Design a protein around this ligand. Structure first.
Ligand code: SF4
Ligand code: SF4
Lengths: 1016, 1016
């Protein structure tokens, strides 16, 4: 047969494979009109009908992220200096740092940074109106691709930490309870269990106060987060999660107790010995209108204060002991107002079975104060909007509302608003929901706050800086003060109040506090993990250090690195005065190794930089200064001489004498003849390496390490030469010999001088990580126990741990700091603590480090595991999507009677059930899996299998198998769903190109396997 | 000395905004946060009730416009899907996959050629297509959190680049010379109306070869609604002109001032004058009117959209008219009636005329608005008001001017039927009224001129919807006039569809048949005539691109399909003698981690542990015979491997020669000896072994052969020299780099084979190893000038291919870019290389880098206003500074108004090549002269960085990179977040390398005295 031609069966499987076309395509406009609907993904502009949402409380947020999408967005963030997003965050979150942590896969460290400044961090990630806060200031707004989804990233990192089931601990900088001064046992009362009080009580507990009680009126906790924000924006178990973190600190909550003239008053608090009080009861009553007096819920009328708690009680499992039904909202619904509560009323009414929702407001569209986040949800659910209408009268017939009459408004000269008596609208309705805002009106509650001063807004007056009322021992914050409009501002009110309550209580016991306010960070048991390590007789407080390179250009930069937390540092390579050099410029350029992606996260750099331009006298004085001020931080002096015994002995002794803990020998100097085509660098010839090491070993008594080039046939040869010469370890590796490319006219970059000259340079960064990782592993297997200092693409705790697993003991970093700044050390440390701690948790063994097992999702939202949706060839577009939504909707209806909510889950943390590993316990554990090719099994073959529910129908697996594989994948012409057939060889290309993490998995082959031989 | 390792006061203060690690939570009162948010605001303010001023401001407001930086990033993101649904959803069926692929590869000519092949109005459409209802509505990436691709903006960018290139369209180069075309092609063809439908029809007819095509246009201007009504701030008029001149390149004639009308042009007069075919493309020329508006005049303030929008167009589009038109003075309140897309253009255009307020008033509800959300968003963002459920009834006129319009309320019932309530009236004040009720064909003289064709119930010409033929077989019709098309792209498609069947009709009238499958020609320019052949080692290649010996050449049927796609040459997968049969393991090919957790397209590397071909030598030898029989012009090179055995290498090389291989490639990867005498394990790492193998093969075969080198050697030049001494005719540089691609957090590797989860060192391929392959190719070409080089290692575009040619290679092998995609990238590489060579002959484009225009100062890809008071004033694009920029820009627009001069739109004439177009032999090795030793690099010509404040996006990355990786030389202003490079810059170039805006930072000659920093 013709071996170079596909048989019919294979020609058929390739039917959809791309081919170069030779003509323009003919398709009629009508034919295209009919075919458009088959593929449609987004809303149809011609559809006027709301999709049925009855009793559907699934997440409708556009900002929710799964891990794949979060990692992408986190790498996109520029991680800016003095970031404007943080300035625009009411709780001043270090967004630069937590997003950096996410891009580094360090989700614990992101959450810790988030909850450090905001103890309701998962709530706020979900509900902050970020367009009017952090996101509104994002520098990436000045790009076509737009601002960063800060809220969703906050939500993602915080969800992962929640799944970790790790508890908050007592501030570990505090003395033992025993030894705490008596002022910290002061009895503290907080009123109302909402965001304001939860924040305040948390920070007070962080400071060490041991007798903190929140008195809550209702039998549920969390305030409006629980009673009114919809389940389909904020799930109740988020609220429960953040309450339990606060309770880990010892804060008490007593439900069913009210601030009210006949119960809790300031007077009674004072009679019972309380030393300070925080008022965070919010705005508990609806703003009402005379037009609606006497209307009952059963006639069809609700305020937002009546309607939203009813819906929350029915849909939020565990909110109440009573299971309660969903309100019977049938027919046409009018929502009054254009604030953000009105839009939640409109969307919640759809969940209760409304046929039609009208939002009616008295001003225009240009006057809607609602954030567009919120407006879009109502718009995409086909609510109707009516402006310039003021209510005048509700029509009641036969005991139920039948219509509302309105008058038109308009804006005049002044801009003052008028009402047009002659211009009326008679709007039919069966239900009316007023969303006019909220107030504090109840005289009995107001009297319980006597005698604090109220302002003309009829709310307690406070000092905006301290949150103190006119009674020095009473503070207030949140909605009740009237400045906060958002959850995060109310959190910030309690946070601000916490410092000044603390100041007040200490002063009542005769003790002062610092004039600089200093609230503690957030802590868990992860932060107590020991990540020190011992290497070549030296003690490293953590395994991360700065490589000899541009971040160590000046010893003042090493100083700031140590102040930030880096365990050790290398001096930039320096030489004797005879060998002074002068750098050229330009000399450091971005790598082209991952295409034209500019800004953060460059996948490589190339440099043509020489040794330090600073003298040996400078570096030696500097090393002495650094070791004087930072005795616990390791300083290694990097030095270079030419091939000359007296110079190497002179320079090493000079550096030893200065107080270096150790030396690093830079083997990059060129030698004599070249001789046997064995490179021009000293470090390429094992005989020169061995001699150089022998010289230094004679001269000094401190440890010294030889820094090895990867640009050799066998690096194990030069490693063993170094050991044979006396070295105490090796550093693996320096940069890879390379050229970063040319402009289109042929001129290089870097291009030096008018002649546009370059020379070969050194490639660094994550593009050389496979090379340095191979070098470390290969030295670690050939020279067991020989200390290795790893260098090459280390940019995270996770990548660092790969190098530790491969035999290295400590971790040098250059390019990752070039891509950022010194503060990445805090990410690296908390990340490594979290990775070691997680090894002790049985319940998380299925995770890969800090990543949960990937489950079936679309757009990071869990696929409904319904019977009728699965196995049934329904991709997420076109008429198949319509059928999916019809299936989901009927199940939600079946879910309204098949009605359970009585198996929640006490949230108890995972306890370590094995000891937490130290660095010495993990070093070199990967080597057991490394071997020759003959040691790999060829009996145990795998095949690919595709999860249809996670597929996004791109066909890349199909194109890759067609033009780089075995033509083993069927791609359906109607559903664009792939299926791996039995001809799969398990090569694993398809999985490698798929854009959805874990959509394709390799599994053990169960059918007989036969290699394809072409001919017998 | 002082303290050398501490920053002096002046440095300390430069470092003021440098990130530092945090030990405490930050206290900031909520009030202070409210008062600081305003300073950093980038995006719209929900509290802003007030449109900025836009009178006489016709700048681009499109959300989708892209600069190169943004376009590359979005093109890189596209999944480049098989059987793409975006293309399914495009009415002209553009190959979106291909053209976006070309954009990601920097091949803007290829992208534009692919666009205009199927859409002769490709630039217009990229600007104005309602993509959310078309191609973007079907995009698979809608199913990710980051959302669908900006297809229109990508199409705009590539077409805009091609426009600047000033390359003309050429006559279809497959046609015979005009002199020997059949007589049928000289048939006189008439088209009526010079809008999109006729421009597209005439273009495609001219492509087919017809030489006598005339468009008769009623007005004095050409372009249809693209000219007369679509606003300048969405579609600049020079776009329309550019597309018209592309038509005229094909010889189509346009005659203005003559109408399809009684007493002018009629089908009867066309027939009598010998016209053989006619296409009616006159659109809908008249406004749909309402009896309520009878008698009202422009003087009173009434317009239809057909009156108003051409008035604004005439005044704002330079080159429409000879009449410098005064902008209609539209002061006060404007009512626009309707909610189709024309209404929204009237709204935004009214503001440009000085309207104080605009009311869009429509007779149904919001859910019933038919306009695409992109069009609505523009009016809503500019603060137009929207009034639903109003039907107009009376227009009140006082003092010769409209003073008000009064309406009645509309309503729906059960039946879905729309009623008007007489008792529910709105009296709205207004000075100007513009009806946007749609357009119609109503002139009796025009319809009469179409006699006797049949008209349907909507009084429109009936067509067969597949052929666009009217009831008269020689008369065709398309566009708005047929009532099917709603868009520019569908109108273009109507003319495209009609052109095939006009061709069929005309050829039949001259007694000739046409093919049963429609074959419209593609779009061609002189670039397509560029020769990209190359000779090397006695072999002729039709282009320099080939498939490397790898997974894309797993089977010979795959090679066959690659040759059918256009590939110049191909390597077999390495094969060997039967006794050397192997068996692959699995998994064995995985994705690179070299650029972080980015999944899907454009993987920066792969790692493989694959062996030689599992298929026999007999299969490969037979396959090479069949491929050479069927593709005599494509080079087939057999890749072969034996152990270090003379008889084996002679036997296998003779077998491959006898099969018909053009040449052989010796895979020097086999082991021999134990391996680390400085020369490792594989034969390719020892020069003596390479010399001997090449001697053996040279004795055995007379066809050329090349040794494939491994980069895993101390000195790759010595291996190339040894091969050359042994008789090789060239070297392939290089194979994969040995590496280990990473470990999971538990220490297991990937790939992991078997239950033991074992692995071995693999080979790294793709763009992450390009610097290594580029260096190897460069060092060989300089050490052994003229010795042929086949380059491999990360080649993924014509641009990167030319880098390797410039560096001394003659041909280019690809593997990983195909694994990332499919075989059809070859068409991108060929057109890209043609364009790069063509442009080297164009004097006017000498400032570009290849196909990249020089970067002009921009924000979000829109050129910043060159206004004096806007420049150097320290006005970043946020906060109170943005608001000042907006005032200054609007004042300048106003000064440009009261002087109404300047109407000189440059006439368009193509750039002529001034020297011959370079061949491949012209460019080979031409960059090598820029390489040198370090000692030939000048240290007297230093540079410094300089920042363009107008392009900056205020991230401070330059600042943090210079602070923690440089010389603390940048001042970052704490209020404006603008950086300034100071005189302490060393030109190291790190800041430029990390900046996210292409060319925002430039390295310029240093003009101040330079002292290296010696610290001493
Ligand atoms: S594992 Fe390889 S052979 Fe199997 S379907 Fe994927 S690409 Fe094809
Ligand atoms: S890195 Fe570029 S965009 Fe960012 S502040 Fe510096 S110059 Fe501006």
């Amino acid at each position: 047969p013709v071996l170079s031609k596909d048989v019919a069966d294979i020609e058929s499987i390739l039917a959809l494979n791309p081919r170069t076309q030779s003509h323009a395509a003919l398709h009629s406009t009508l034919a295209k009109k009919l075919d458009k609907k088959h593929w449609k993904r987004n809303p149809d502009k011609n559809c006027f009908h709301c999709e049925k949402l009855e009793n559907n409380f699934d997440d409708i947020k556009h900002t929710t992220l799964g891990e794949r999408g979060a990692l992408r967005e986190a790498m996109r963030c520029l991680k800016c200096a003095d970031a404007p997003c943080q300035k625009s965050c009411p709780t001043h979150l270090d967004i630069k740092s937590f997003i950096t942590s996410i891009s580094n896969k360090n989700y614990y460290g992101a959450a810790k940074m988030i909850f450090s400044d905001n103890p309701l961090g998962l709530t706020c990630g979900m509900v902050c109106p970020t367009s009017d806060l952090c996101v509104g200031g994002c520098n990436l707004y000045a790009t076509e691709e737009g601002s960063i989804n800060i809220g969703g990233l906050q939500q993602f990192a915080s969800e992962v930490f929640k799944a970790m089931n790790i508890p908050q601990i007592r501030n570990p900088c505090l003395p033992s309870q025993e030894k705490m001064p008596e002022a910290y046992s002061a009895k503290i009362a907080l009123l109302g269990a909402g965001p304001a009080s939860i924040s305040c009580a948390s920070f007070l507990a962080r400071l060490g106060y041991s007798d903190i009680t929140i008195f809550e009126k209702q039998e549920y906790v969390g305030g409006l987060s629980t009673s009114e924000i919809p389940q389909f924006r904020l799930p109740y178990d988020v609220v429960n999660f953040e309450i339990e973190l606060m309770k880990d600190l010892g804060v008490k909550i007593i439900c069913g107790k009210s601030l009210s003239e006949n119960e809790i008053t300031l007077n009674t608090l004072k009679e019972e010995g309380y030393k300070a009080a925080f008022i965070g009861i919010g705005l508990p009553e609806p703003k009402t209108d005379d037009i609606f007096q006497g209307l009952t819920q059963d006639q069809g009328f609700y305020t937002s204060k009546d309607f939203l708690p009813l819906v929350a009680k029915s849909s939020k499992a565990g909110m109440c002991a009573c299971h309660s039904p969903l309100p019977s909202i049938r027919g046409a619904v009018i929502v009054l107002g254009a604030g953000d509560t009105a839009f939640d009323c409109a969307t919640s009414a759809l969940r209760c079975g409304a046929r039609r929702v009208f939002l009616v407001f008295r001003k225009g569209f240009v006057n809607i104060r609602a954030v567009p986040e919120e407006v879009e949800l109502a718009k995409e659910e086909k609510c109707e909007f009516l402006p310039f209408l003021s209510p005048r009268k509700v029509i009641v017939k036969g005991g139920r509302i039948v219509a509302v009459q309105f008058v038109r408004t308009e804006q005049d000269e002044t801009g003052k608003w008028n009402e047009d008596e002659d211009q009326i609208v008679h709007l039919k309705a069966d239900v009316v929901i007023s969303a006019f805002g909220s107030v504090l009106r109840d005289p009995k509650v107001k009297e319980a706050l006597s005698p604090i001063k109220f302002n003309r807004w009829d709310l307690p007056e406070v000092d905006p800086e301290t949150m103190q009322t006119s009674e020095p021992w009473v503070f207030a914050g949140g909605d009740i003060v009237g400045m906060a409009n958002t959850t995060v501002e109310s959190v910030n009110d309690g946070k601000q109040a916490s410092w000044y309550i603390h100041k007040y209580i200490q002063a009542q016991y005769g003790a002062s506090v610092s004039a600089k306010p200093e609230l503690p960070l957030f802590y868990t048991p992860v932060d107590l993990v020991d990540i020190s390590v011992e290497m070549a007789g030296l003690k490293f407080i953590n395994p991360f250090g700065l490589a000899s390179a541009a971040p160590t250009t000046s010893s003042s930069m090493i100083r700031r690195a140590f102040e930030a937390g880096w365990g050790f540092a290398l001096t930039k390579t320096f030489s004797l005065d005879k060998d002074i050099v002068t750098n050229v410029s330009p000399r450091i350029v971005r790598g082209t190794t991952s295409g034209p992606m500019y800004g953060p996260g460059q996948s490589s750099f190339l440099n043509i930089e020489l040794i330090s331009e600073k003298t040996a006298a400078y570096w030696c004085q500097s090393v002495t200064e650094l070791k004087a001020d930072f005795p616990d931080n390791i300083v290694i002096a990097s030095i270079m001489c030419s091939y000359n015994k007296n110079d190497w002995m002179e320079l090493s002794r000079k550096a030893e004498a200065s107080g270096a803990d150790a030396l690093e020998l830079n083997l990059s100097c060129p030698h004599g003849m070249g001789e046997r085509g064995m490179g021009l660098a000293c470090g390429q010839d094992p005989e020169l390496v061995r001699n150089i090491c022998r010289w230094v070993r004679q001269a000094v008594q401190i440890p010294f390490f030889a820094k090895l080039t990867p640009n050799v046939t066998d690096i194990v040869s030069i490693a063993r030469a170094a050991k044979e010469g006396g070295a105490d370890g090796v550093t693996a590796t320096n940069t890879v010999s390379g050229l970063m490319g040319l402009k289109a006219d042929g001129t290089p970059w870097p291009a030096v001088g008018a002649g546009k000259r370059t020379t070969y340079g050194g490639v660094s960064g994550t593009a050389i990580r496979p090379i340095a990782l191979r070098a470390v592993t290969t030295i670690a297997r050939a020279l067991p126990g020989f200390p290795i200092l790893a260098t090459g693409g280390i940019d995270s705790a996770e990548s660092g741990l790969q190098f530790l697993h491969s035999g290295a003991s400590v971790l040098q970093v250059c390019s990752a700091v070039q891509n950022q700044d010194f503060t990445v050390i805090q990410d690296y440390c908390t990340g490594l603590k979290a990775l070691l701690y997680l090894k002790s948790i049985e319940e998380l063994q299925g995770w890969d480090g800090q990543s949960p097992g990937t489950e079936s999702h679309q757009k990071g939202k869990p696929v409904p595991r319904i019977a009728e949706l699965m196995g049934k060839k329904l991709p997420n577009f076109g008429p198949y999507l319509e059928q999916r939504k019809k299936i989901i909707a009927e199940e939600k209806m079946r879910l309204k009677e098949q009605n359970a909510a009585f198996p929640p889950l006490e949230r108890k943390p995972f306890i370590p059930k094995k000891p937490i590993p130290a660095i010495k316990d993990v070093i070199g554990k990967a080597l057991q899996y490394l071997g020759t090719f003959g040691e790999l099994s060829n009996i145990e073959q795998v095949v690919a299998v595709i999860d249809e529910e996670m597929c996004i129908n791109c066909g890349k697996c199909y194109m890759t198998c067609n033009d780089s594989g075995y033509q083993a994948i069927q791609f359906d012409p109607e559903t664009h769903l792939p299926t791996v057939t039995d001809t799969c060889t398990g090569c694993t290309l398809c999985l490698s190109v798929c854009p959805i993490i874990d959509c394709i998995r390799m599994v053990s082959r169960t059918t007989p396997y036969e290699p394809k031989r072409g001919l017998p």
